Design a protein around this nucleic acid. Structure first.
Ligand SMILES: [Mg+2]
Ligand SMILES: [Mg+2]
Ligand SMILES: [Mg+2]
Ligand SMILES: [Mg+2]
Ligand SMILES: [Mg+2]
Ligand SMILES: [Mg+2]
Ligand SMILES: [Mg+2]
Ligand SMILES: [Mg+2]
Ligand SMILES: [Mg+2]
Ligand SMILES: [Mg+2]
Ligand SMILES: [Mg+2]
Ligand SMILES: [Mg+2]
Ligand SMILES: [Mg+2]
Ligand SMILES: [Mg+2]
Ligand SMILES: [Mg+2]
Ligand SMILES: [Mg+2]
Ligand SMILES: [Mg+2]
Ligand SMILES: [Mg+2]
Ligand SMILES: [Mg+2]
Ligand SMILES: [Mg+2]
Ligand SMILES: [Mg+2]
Ligand SMILES: [Mg+2]
Ligand SMILES: [Mg+2]
Ligand SMILES: [Mg+2]
Ligand SMILES: [Mg+2]
Ligand SMILES: [Mg+2]
Ligand SMILES: [Mg+2]
Ligand SMILES: [Mg+2]
Ligand SMILES: [Mg+2]
Ligand SMILES: [Mg+2]
Ligand SMILES: [Mg+2]
Ligand SMILES: [Mg+2]
Ligand SMILES: [Mg+2]
Ligand SMILES: [Mg+2]
Ligand SMILES: [Mg+2]
Ligand SMILES: [Mg+2]
Ligand SMILES: [Mg+2]
Ligand SMILES: [Mg+2]
Ligand SMILES: [Mg+2]
Ligand SMILES: [Mg+2]
Ligand SMILES: [Mg+2]
Ligand SMILES: [Mg+2]
Ligand SMILES: [Mg+2]
Ligand SMILES: [Mg+2]
Ligand SMILES: [Mg+2]
Ligand SMILES: [Mg+2]
Ligand SMILES: [Mg+2]
Ligand SMILES: [Mg+2]
Ligand SMILES: [Mg+2]
Ligand SMILES: [Mg+2]
Ligand SMILES: [Mg+2]
Ligand SMILES: [Mg+2]
Ligand SMILES: [Mg+2]
Ligand SMILES: [Mg+2]
Ligand SMILES: [Mg+2]
Ligand SMILES: [Mg+2]
Ligand SMILES: [Mg+2]
Ligand SMILES: [Mg+2]
Ligand SMILES: [Mg+2]
Ligand SMILES: [Mg+2]
Ligand SMILES: [Mg+2]
Ligand SMILES: [Mg+2]
Ligand SMILES: [Mg+2]
Ligand SMILES: [Mg+2]
Ligand SMILES: [Mg+2]
Ligand SMILES: [Mg+2]
Ligand SMILES: [Mg+2]
Ligand SMILES: [Mg+2]
Ligand SMILES: [Mg+2]
Ligand SMILES: [Mg+2]
Ligand SMILES: [Mg+2]
Ligand SMILES: [Mg+2]
Ligand SMILES: [Mg+2]
Ligand SMILES: [Mg+2]
Ligand SMILES: [Mg+2]
Ligand SMILES: [Mg+2]
Ligand SMILES: [Mg+2]
Ligand SMILES: [Mg+2]
Ligand SMILES: [Mg+2]
Ligand SMILES: [Mg+2]
Ligand SMILES: [Mg+2]
Ligand SMILES: [Mg+2]
Ligand SMILES: [Mg+2]
Ligand SMILES: [Mg+2]
Ligand SMILES: [Mg+2]
Ligand SMILES: [Mg+2]
Ligand SMILES: [Mg+2]
Ligand SMILES: [Mg+2]
Ligand SMILES: [Mg+2]
Ligand SMILES: [Mg+2]
Ligand SMILES: [Mg+2]
Ligand SMILES: [Mg+2]
Ligand SMILES: [Mg+2]
Ligand SMILES: [Mg+2]
Ligand SMILES: [Mg+2]
Ligand SMILES: [Mg+2]
Ligand SMILES: [Mg+2]
Ligand SMILES: [Mg+2]
Ligand SMILES: [Mg+2]
Ligand SMILES: [Mg+2]
Ligand SMILES: [Mg+2]
Ligand SMILES: [Mg+2]
Ligand SMILES: [Mg+2]
Ligand SMILES: [Mg+2]
Ligand SMILES: [Mg+2]
Ligand SMILES: [Mg+2]
Ligand SMILES: [Mg+2]
Ligand SMILES: [Mg+2]
Ligand SMILES: [Mg+2]
Ligand SMILES: [Mg+2]
Ligand SMILES: [Mg+2]
Ligand SMILES: [Mg+2]
Ligand SMILES: [Mg+2]
Ligand SMILES: [Mg+2]
Ligand SMILES: [Mg+2]
Ligand SMILES: [Mg+2]
Ligand SMILES: [Mg+2]
Ligand SMILES: [Mg+2]
Ligand SMILES: [Mg+2]
Ligand SMILES: [Mg+2]
Ligand SMILES: [Mg+2]
Ligand SMILES: [Mg+2]
Ligand SMILES: [Mg+2]
Lengths: 150, 62, 117, 202
RNA sequence: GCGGGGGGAACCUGGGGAACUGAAACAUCUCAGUACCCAGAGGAGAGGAAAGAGAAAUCGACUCCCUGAGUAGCGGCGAGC
RNA sequence: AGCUGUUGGGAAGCAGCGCCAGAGAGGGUGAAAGCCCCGUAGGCGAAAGGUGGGGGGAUAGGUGAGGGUACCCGAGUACCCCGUGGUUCGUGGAGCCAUGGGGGAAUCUGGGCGGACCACCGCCUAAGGCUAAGUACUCCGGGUGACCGAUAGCGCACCAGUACCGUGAGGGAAAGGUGAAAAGAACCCCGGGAGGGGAGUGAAAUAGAGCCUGAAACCGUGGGCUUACAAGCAGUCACGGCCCCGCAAGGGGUUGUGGCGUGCCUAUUGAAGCAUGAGCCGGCGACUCACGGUCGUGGGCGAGCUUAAGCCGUUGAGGCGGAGGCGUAGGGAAACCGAGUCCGAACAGGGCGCAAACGGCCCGCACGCGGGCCGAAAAGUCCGCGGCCGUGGACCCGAAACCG
RNA sequence: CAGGUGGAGCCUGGGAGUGAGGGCGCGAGCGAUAACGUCCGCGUCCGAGCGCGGGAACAACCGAGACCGCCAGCUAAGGCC
RNA sequence: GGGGGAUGACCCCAGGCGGUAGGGGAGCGUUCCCGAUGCCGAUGAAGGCCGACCCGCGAGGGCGGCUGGAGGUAAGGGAAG
RNA sequence: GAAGGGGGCCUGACUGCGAGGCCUGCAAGCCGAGCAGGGGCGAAAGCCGGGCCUAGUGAACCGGUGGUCCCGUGUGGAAGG
């Protein structure tokens, strides 16, 4: 091609509402802020997703619950991430929780729980936990260990 | 900078996956009350906005 | 990059002051009074256009009613005669007809006097 | 696009290449945008009413002088004051997706190929860098400088030979970029270059 | 005998240390250990070689960037931090 | 590595025939030059002073095993209590680090710590000191700019922190341009000079130094149309006269009479309004940017998408880097279970959740079956653009005041 | 249940502005069967139609919803010495 | 909107087209960048002053004359003091 | 034709829920058949989740008290939730 022929698509660099500026540019004089009082002021208003005009807000009248944590903070307990059967179909191999993260499921500092949705496969499946359903579904076609170490 | 996620929005509500918000119901000191007041007593699906406010107040990620 | 006014505003102003040529005092010489005056000339022009149409017909009417009162009638009746007489061919524009072609007018009077009674 | 002329002393023998059949001129323009953006220096600045020299003193009482009403003279409303909202140093770079750069690289070559403008060459012999020497081989290879040429080779000597030509731009292969392809009427590579170009895409 | 003294744009450590403002009022809270004042250091200053981290039979000084993460928590459990 | 000819005041333009290039960056030269000048690519260079984190060499320092003794292992210290500070920790279950006050130890079987405390199991050895580098900055020098171009850019392009103003701290400006070259106008004339007229210089002198361009408000001379019985937001529509241009038809100017006619902006239920603002003209003047968010939109890839710092590499060359992040499951205060889960005695009910979309070809009785191949779409996610929001001075200007 | 294709209606979302109204008719309250008064209701116009015609002049009364042009026609209100 | 089946910029036909706050849409113009080692330029750049002329609904763009004396910068795209 | 008055047996002034609606800017307020558990009165049909009904009220936060399964900062406890 040629630098003269390049150009973007009809969407794509829309560009741009700025006024300001003319009468019957639309948008002149009050610059769309509409006359007024506070909202049209430079600092504008008070943060609408919260402020209610001085009555007590709609949040903050709801009660709260239950455990919010105390000071040394979050407690250290092993987290599990469930992955499905339907999800792990494509793997013909060993299927270790190690391998699984490499796929783009199983995250990192999470233990493995395979579960539920999908049909099993005659696969070795290494993991930390199995649901009621997934253990069975599996036990029909293939077979699997449970992982505990360290 | 990074938005700050308001704490107690977070302590009073939950965004029910897909897509909206759910709070408890409202009464905490009462003798003569029907025994509904064990009704509700349960969680309440807030109206709207009230949910778009909230929501936008706690983000990244909920 | 910074785009300073430069040449733009002088041009825009010149355009308008040009339009304002001939206007009295400052109204020709000051871009503001020029512009103000012009708003006014603009709406008068528009309004007076619609009304030139009125201004003219009302002249034609006085002229007819004048000429055919020589022949002893109202404009009021004349038009009615001409309405009945089928002669709805108008006029009132032509009316030079009453001035430049008197007899052709007179004939037109008589076609008018005799209609529907 | 597929069938692309090679130049060997042996003969004009021709090569086939994978090279996508549809070019996406938007995608193309997107990489060029990016190329030209990230290279932006972004050095333009101005002083806010805060950063200007003058004092903070209130210029006049604010009632009863009969004059208008003011703060410091650093106020933007004043000739000589701060600038409102004008430019500060900033970084125009963004991160294109890498797959978009691959695609865009591939397509822009493809587009030169599809035109028959792309040529592969073996070994030159217009080496021993001298622009007189190059300008000879160039002629013999059918480049008269009637069309701008992007010369891609890893040979320091040929590169510095072509460099000073008004119609040549010149590149190491690891520096193949789409902007440069599109600017130039004809693409010319040696086979060392075409390799690493192929090893970049995919 | 040897040294000190004073100066230096900003940057640095240490001693001291606000208010407007925010909280749509206001005291805790915020602004903020900011502004500023003082001492001192240098081309940098500080910090530094575990009486550490903190759940793994784990890691190994200190500093700086990215990330962890607006997470854990803190909070007239408010504003906000 | 370049000459000639040509227009021109001037060649670097145009034309002819050449040539260099590791140099076609850029600036000059009477206008537009690779080859006229200064440069550029590529190279070279220190007697003296500085540096010297690199290379080299020296010196300082360093270097064991088993047993036995229980000698030493940082004191107003640890530790406890009171009062406080630091930490995300605002008295909280409040530990840890620090320490103003009181009491006040031990030396490995000693002590501190893992968030009150106790046990157990670990981690570490306080009350002495020093320690490059990776980091911050920019008075200073250099290089670059989708940085400004004399109301801009620093306050200052100019003898500016100056004039000037303030007792003082302190405040704090305006002000750039003849010409290629001064060739900066000899001499004569009017004139006290200033100024001007000739003369002369110049391509040009309304480039003449109060000097490039030279706008507008403003002032003036000359000309045309017009005006002294008309009265009004000053215009407008129509006709007519006089003047100009045009063969003509047509147009430009001006205004006699006629018709119509309540300035602009702002603020208001409502303004010509006897409500706000504006003497007029020029120039300056107000919706931004960063990071988040939320929608839309243009594309890339799609059960995935995508990199951050940084590393390499670069005539304004890109690449690598998978820590991480969003997504792929939800319910539940949590333990926890999981296509479910939560309340519940309940397999009552209910809350919040879960359910591949097309075309078409291989095929199990047939044209869909259903699985499956091929691939238009797409969850999602990435980047760009746009709207809006959050935080920041967040559209601009303005207090009275508060504090150091 | 039918007619009604409309700058109609419903659903999801993005962006607003407004939250000082005024006159008039009708229906009430307050007021004095006062106010260019005040407060509601249902309607309308001005607002934003201080654009046009009528009402001497005149936001809101009568007429009528101004895309542009014409030295053409018919009307509305109100008029025709 | 319906046709015409050119896939529009094009021709028929029917409608709509008062507007403040405000929403939506398309354009014009100024500075800068790529396009440019290019192209326009002393047979005269930008800027200035006239114009009753051409194109555009308009913002604007042309063209001609005068002044000016060294710059300007298409088509197509990017960014904003 | 009881919602009024009298008497007898009784504690449904239950627990777990709750189709579907009234109302309604939100948040609230309201009525509610029906199923399950265990009951009461009744021969049964049946009625019973206070009172003929419409007022007798107070979001959240902070804290008290009783209980329980839930969490317990290396672990068991405990502190505290
Ligand atoms: Mg405008
Ligand atoms: Mg708009
Ligand atoms: Mg508008
Ligand atoms: Mg708005
Ligand atoms: Mg205003
Ligand atoms: Mg407003
Ligand atoms: Mg108001
Ligand atoms: Mg404000
Ligand atoms: Mg209140
Ligand atoms: Mg509660
Ligand atoms: Mg939590
Ligand atoms: Mg409670
Ligand atoms: Mg997150
Ligand atoms: Mg401006
Ligand atoms: Mg008419
Ligand atoms: Mg007739
Ligand atoms: Mg720049
Ligand atoms: Mg200041
Ligand atoms: Mg002050
Ligand atoms: Mg005054
Ligand atoms: Mg300035
Ligand atoms: Mg000193
Ligand atoms: Mg010193
Ligand atoms: Mg300090
Ligand atoms: Mg305060
Ligand atoms: Mg205060
Ligand atoms: Mg306040
Ligand atoms: Mg306030
Ligand atoms: Mg106050
Ligand atoms: Mg603080
Ligand atoms: Mg020193
Ligand atoms: Mg150091
Ligand atoms: Mg030290
Ligand atoms: Mg703080
Ligand atoms: Mg000559
Ligand atoms: Mg020559
Ligand atoms: Mg030329
Ligand atoms: Mg040059
Ligand atoms: Mg040239
Ligand atoms: Mg040159
Ligand atoms: Mg050199
Ligand atoms: Mg001992
Ligand atoms: Mg202790
Ligand atoms: Mg504290
Ligand atoms: Mg503390
Ligand atoms: Mg407290
Ligand atoms: Mg302890
Ligand atoms: Mg200790
Ligand atoms: Mg520890
Ligand atoms: Mg330790
Ligand atoms: Mg020790
Ligand atoms: Mg030590
Ligand atoms: Mg040190
Ligand atoms: Mg410098
Ligand atoms: Mg500029
Ligand atoms: Mg100046
Ligand atoms: Mg200046
Ligand atoms: Mg100037
Ligand atoms: Mg200045
Ligand atoms: Mg003085
Ligand atoms: Mg001469
Ligand atoms: Mg002269
Ligand atoms: Mg001149
Ligand atoms: Mg001149
Ligand atoms: Mg000059
Ligand atoms: Mg001049
Ligand atoms: Mg005169
Ligand atoms: Mg008279
Ligand atoms: Mg007269
Ligand atoms: Mg008079
Ligand atoms: Mg008149
Ligand atoms: Mg205005
Ligand atoms: Mg006002
Ligand atoms: Mg008022
Ligand atoms: Mg008023
Ligand atoms: Mg007046
Ligand atoms: Mg007044
Ligand atoms: Mg006035
Ligand atoms: Mg006022
Ligand atoms: Mg005003
Ligand atoms: Mg002006
Ligand atoms: Mg953004
Ligand atoms: Mg956005
Ligand atoms: Mg996007
Ligand atoms: Mg590099
Ligand atoms: Mg169930
Ligand atoms: Mg369920
Ligand atoms: Mg359900
Ligand atoms: Mg796709
Ligand atoms: Mg996508
Ligand atoms: Mg119907
Ligand atoms: Mg509608
Ligand atoms: Mg909407
Ligand atoms: Mg009101
Ligand atoms: Mg109304
Ligand atoms: Mg009202
Ligand atoms: Mg009546
Ligand atoms: Mg009234
Ligand atoms: Mg009345
Ligand atoms: Mg009304
Ligand atoms: Mg209004
Ligand atoms: Mg009206
Ligand atoms: Mg209306
Ligand atoms: Mg009026
Ligand atoms: Mg009238
Ligand atoms: Mg209309
Ligand atoms: Mg009538
Ligand atoms: Mg039409
Ligand atoms: Mg309109
Ligand atoms: Mg010449
Ligand atoms: Mg320019
Ligand atoms: Mg010109
Ligand atoms: Mg250009
Ligand atoms: Mg501006
Ligand atoms: Mg009884
Ligand atoms: Mg319900
Ligand atoms: Mg029962
Ligand atoms: Mg509170
Ligand atoms: Mg509590
Ligand atoms: Mg339970
Ligand atoms: Mg337990
Ligand atoms: Mg512990
Ligand atoms: Mg424990």
């Amino acid at each position: 091609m040629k630098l003269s022929d390049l150009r973007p698509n009809p969407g794509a660099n829309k560009r741009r509402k700025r006024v300001g500026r003319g009468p019957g540019s639309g948008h002149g004089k009050t610059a769309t802020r509409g006359h007024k009082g506070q909202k049209s002021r430079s600092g504008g208003l008070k943060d609408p997703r919260r402020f209610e005009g001085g009555r007590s807000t709609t949040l903050m009248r709801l009660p709260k619950r239950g455990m919010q944590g105390q000071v040394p903070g979050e407690i250290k307990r092993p987290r599990y991430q469930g992955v499905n059967l339907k999800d792990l179909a494509r793997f013909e191999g060993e299927v270790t929780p190690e391998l699984l993260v490499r796929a783009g499921l199983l995250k990192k500092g999470y233990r493995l729980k395979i579960l539920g949705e999908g049909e099993a496969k005659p696969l070795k499946v290494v993991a930390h936990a199995f649901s009621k359903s997934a253990l069975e579904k599996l036990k029909a076609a293939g077979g699997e260990p449970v992982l505990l170490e360290a | 900078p990074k938005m700050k996620t308001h704490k107690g929005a977070k302590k009073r509500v939950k965004i029910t996956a897909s897509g909206k918000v759910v709070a408890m119901k409202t009464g905490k000191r009462h003798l003569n009350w029907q025994k509904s007041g064990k009704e509700i007593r349960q969680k309440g699906r807030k109206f709207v906005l009230a949910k778009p406010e909230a929501e936008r107040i706690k983000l990244l990620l909920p | 990059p910074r785009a300073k006014t430069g040449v733009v505003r002088r041009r825009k102003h010149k355009k308008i002051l040009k339009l304002a040529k001939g206007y009295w005092g400052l109204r020709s010489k000051s871009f503001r009074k020029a512009r103000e005056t012009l708003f006014a000339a603009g709406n008068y022009a528009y309004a007076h256009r619609k009304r030139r149409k009125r201004d003219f017909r009302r002249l034609w009417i006085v002229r007819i009613n004048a000429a055919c009162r020589q022949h002893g009638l109202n404009y009021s009746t004349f038009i009615h005669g001409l309405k009945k007489a089928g002669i709805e061919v108008d006029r009132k524009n032509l009316a030079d007809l009453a001035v430049r072609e008197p007899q052709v007018f007179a004939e037109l009077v008589e076609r008018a006097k005799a209609a529907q009674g | 696009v597929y069938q692309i002329p090679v130049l060997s002393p042996s003969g004009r023998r021709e090569l086939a290449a994978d090279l996508p059949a549809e070019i996406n001129p938007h995608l193309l323009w997107e990489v060029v945008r990016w190329q030209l953006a990230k290279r932006r220096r972004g050095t333009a600045s101005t002083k806010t009413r805060g950063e200007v020299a003058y004092s903070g003193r209130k210029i006049w009482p604010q009632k009863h002088t009969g004059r208008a009403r003011h703060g410091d003279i650093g106020a933007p409303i004043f000739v000589g004051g701060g600038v409102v909202f004008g430019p500060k140093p900033r970084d125009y770079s963004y991160t294109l997706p890498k797959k978009v750069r691959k695609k865009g690289l591939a397509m822009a070559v493809a587009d030169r190929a599809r035109e028959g403008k792309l040529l592969l060459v073996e070994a030159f012999a217009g080496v021993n860098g001298k622009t007189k020497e190059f300008l000879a081989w160039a002629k013999e290879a059918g480049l008269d400088g009637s069309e701008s040429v992007l010369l891609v080779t890893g040979n320091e000597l040929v590169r510095r030979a072509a460099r000073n030509l008004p119609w040549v731009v010149t590149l190491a292969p690891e520096g193949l970029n789409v902007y440069d392809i599109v600017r130039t009427e004809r693409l010319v590579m040696d086979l060392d270059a075409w390799e690493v170009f192929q090893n970049r895409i995919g």
